[PDB]
Design a protein around this ligand. Sequence first.
Ligand SMILES: NC(=O)c1ccc[n+]([C@@H]2O[C@H](COP(=O)([O-])OP(=O)(O)OC[C@H]3O[C@@H](n4cnc5c(N)ncnc54)[C@H](OP(=O)(O)O)[C@@H]3O)[C@@H](O)[C@H]2O)c1
Ligand SMILES: NC(=O)c1ccc[n+]([C@@H]2O[C@H](COP(=O)([O-])OP(=O)(O)OC[C@H]3O[C@@H](n4cnc5c(N)ncnc54)[C@H](OP(=O)(O)O)[C@@H]3O)[C@@H](O)[C@H]2O)c1
Ligand SMILES: COc1cccc2c1C(=O)c1ccc3c(c1C2=O)C(=O)C[C@](C)(O)C3
Ligand SMILES: COc1cccc2c1C(=O)c1ccc3c(c1C2=O)C(=O)C[C@](C)(O)C3
Lengths: 254, 254
Amino acid sequence: SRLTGKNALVTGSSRGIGRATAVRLAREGALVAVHYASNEAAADETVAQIEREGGRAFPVRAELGVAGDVHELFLGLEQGLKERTGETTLDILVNNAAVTGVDGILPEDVTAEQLDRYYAVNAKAPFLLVQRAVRNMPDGGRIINISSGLTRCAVPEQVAYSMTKGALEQITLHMAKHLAPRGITVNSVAPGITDNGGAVFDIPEIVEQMAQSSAFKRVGEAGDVADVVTFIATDESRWITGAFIDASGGTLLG
Amino acid sequence: SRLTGKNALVTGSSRGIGRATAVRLAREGALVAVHYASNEAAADETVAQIEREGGRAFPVRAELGVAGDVHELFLGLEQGLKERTGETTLDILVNNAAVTGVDGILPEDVTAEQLDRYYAVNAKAPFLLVQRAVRNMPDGGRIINISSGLTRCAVPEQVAYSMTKGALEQITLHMAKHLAPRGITVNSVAPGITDNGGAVFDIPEIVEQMAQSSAFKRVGEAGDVADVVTFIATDESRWITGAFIDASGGTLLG
Ligand SMILES: NC(=O)c1ccc[n+]([C@@H]2O[C@H](COP(=O)([O-])OP(=O)(O)OC[C@H]3O[C@@H](n4cnc5c(N)ncnc54)[C@H](OP(=O)(O)O)[C@@H]3O)[C@@H](O)[C@H]2O)c1
Ligand SMILES: NC(=O)c1ccc[n+]([C@@H]2O[C@H](COP(=O)([O-])OP(=O)(O)OC[C@H]3O[C@@H](n4cnc5c(N)ncnc54)[C@H](OP(=O)(O)O)[C@@H]3O)[C@@H](O)[C@H]2O)c1
Ligand SMILES: COc1cccc2c1C(=O)c1ccc3c(c1C2=O)C(=O)C[C@](C)(O)C3
Ligand SMILES: COc1cccc2c1C(=O)c1ccc3c(c1C2=O)C(=O)C[C@](C)(O)C3
C-alpha cells in the first residue's frame, strides 16, 4: 500500500495499458480517476474491477485533442476528487491516452489531418494536461508520460505516431528540469508491442511475428508495462527524473 | 517481502551504496552475501544491521582485480549459501564494488598502471563475475551493474574512471540479449554524486557545491540509489532489460 491517501489520474484507462495501470495504482491505495473518451462501458469495467478489489475509482469522460478538452477533464476530475476527499489534490498524472491504432500508415499515405490528430492528442494535450495538473500537485508529485520504443526503432508505417512520441519525450526532458525545484518528477516509460486486448492479439500467427521484436520472444502484457509505471509513481523512484525508462521487454537492444 | 527465498550477492556492500543496497534487499527477504575487499569491520556492520532488522546475511571477503578473485569470492559465497539454505543458487548479482579517487586524475597524469587498476576492478571483474554467477542462476534472475552518470557527462578529470563505466555498460547491453532466453535481466543503474559516508560528505561547503549537480540541488543519499536497485531486483521489473536507468537525481538535465 505505497500510495495510501494519494490521488491519481490515468488518461485512457478504459482499456489496455491504462486499465492495467489504474488497477495497480488502486491496489496500492490511490484514488484513481479513470479517464476515457468514448468507451464508457470499458471505463465502467476498469472502475468495477478496482471497486471489487477493494479500491476507489471513478470515471471521467473527456475527448482530448479538441477545444475545451483539458477544462472538461479537470471539471470531472475535481468534482470526483472533492466529493470523495474534500480536496482536489492530484499526486500522480499518467499521460497514457493516445491515438495509437495498430494499423500502419506508410509515409506516402499520411495526411495533414492525421498529423494534426496524432499531435493534438499525443503531444499537445499531454503538454497542456501537465500545465493544468501541476496547479493541483503537491511537492513530491509524479508525472509519467507513456511513450513508445518506436522513438528508438525505425518503423516507417508508424512515422506519424512516432513524431508525436518524440515530442512527448521532450515534455519529459524540459519539464523534469522545470519542476525539479518542487520535487515533482517527470519521466517517460516506453512500451514495446503490448497486448491491449485488440483483435490483432487474437491471431496467434501475427502475435508470433510481433513477439520476435522482444529479446524474450513474447509480446508484452499490459501488466508488464503497468508494473513499471506503478513503481515510478511510488516514493522509491524519487531519484529518477527526466529519464527514459525502457519497458519494452528487451526490444531496444538494436 | 518481494525477495523471500532469494539469494543475492552485492559486491562492495561493506560501505556506501552497496551497504544501503544489501540492507534493502534483506528487508525484502533476500539472503544477502555482503562482499568486501578488506574492511571486515564495515562488512560485519552491514551484516549486523541486516540481522537487527530481522533478515539474513553473511560476509564474503575477496579482493577484485587480482588473480584468483572470482574463485575466492565464489568459494565464500557458495559456502555461506550452502550452510544457510543447502543450495548454492544465486538469484541476484549486483556489480557495485569499484575503484575511484576522492577528486579524479587529470588526463595528462593518468598512468598505464592506473588504467589497468581501474579496468581490472571496474570492468573486467564485473564481466567475469557475471560469467561465473550465471552457473548458479535460475531462470528469472537479475544482474544489476552500477555505472555512473559520467558516461553521459564530460568531466576530463574522470576520463579513466569513466572509460571503465563505459565498458561496464556494454556488459549490460550484450549480456541482456545473451541471457534473455533464460529470463535473466541485465540492467545498468547510474548514480550521480552520492553520499557514501566518505569524509568529504562531512564538509558542508563542499557538499553544497556537489549538490548543484543534481536538478534537486542536494547530493544523493545511498538509499536513493539503493531503492532503485532494489526495485530492479524484484519481479515487477521483468520487462526492463538491457536498460540504462538514471538514478542521478536529474544530473543529466544540466
Ligand atoms: N500497446 C502497444 O503495443 C503500445 C506500444 C507502445 C506504446 N504504447 C502506448 O501506450 C499507451 C497505451 O496504449 P494502449 O495500447 O493500451 O492503448 P489502447 O488500448 O488503444 O487504449 C487507448 C486509450 O486511450 C484513450 N483515448 C484514445 N484516443 C483518445 C482521445 N482522443 N481522447 C481521450 N482518450 C483517448 C482510449 O479511450 P476509449 O476507450 O474511450 O477509446 C483508451 O482508454 C499509449 O500512449 C500508446 O501509444 C502502446
Ligand atoms: N558515490 C558516488 O558519488 C558514486 C557516483 C557514481 C557512481 N558510483 C558507483 O556506485 C558504486 C558504489 O559506490 P560507493 O561510492 O558506494 O563506493 P565506496 O563507498 O567507495 O565503497 C566501495 C565498496 O567497494 C569495495 N571495493 C572497492 N574496491 C574493491 C576491490 N578491488 N575489490 C573488492 N571490493 C572492492 C569496498 O570494499 P572495502 O570496504 O573492503 O574497502 C566497498 O565495499 C560504484 O560502482 C561507484 O563507481 C558512486
Ligand atoms: C521493432 O518494432 C518495435 C520496436 C519498439 C516498439 C515498437 C515496435 C513495433 O514494431 C511496433 C509496431 C506497431 C505499434 C507499436 C510498435 C512498438 O511499440 C506501438 O508503438 C503501438 C502502435 C503504434 O499502436 C503499433
Ligand atoms: C557533471 O557531473 C556529473 C554528472 C553525472 C554524474 C557525476 C557527475 C560528477 O560531477 C561526479 C563527480 C565525481 C564523481 C562522480 C560523479 C558523478 O557520478 C562519480 O561517478 C564517482 C566518482 C568518480 O568517484 C566521483
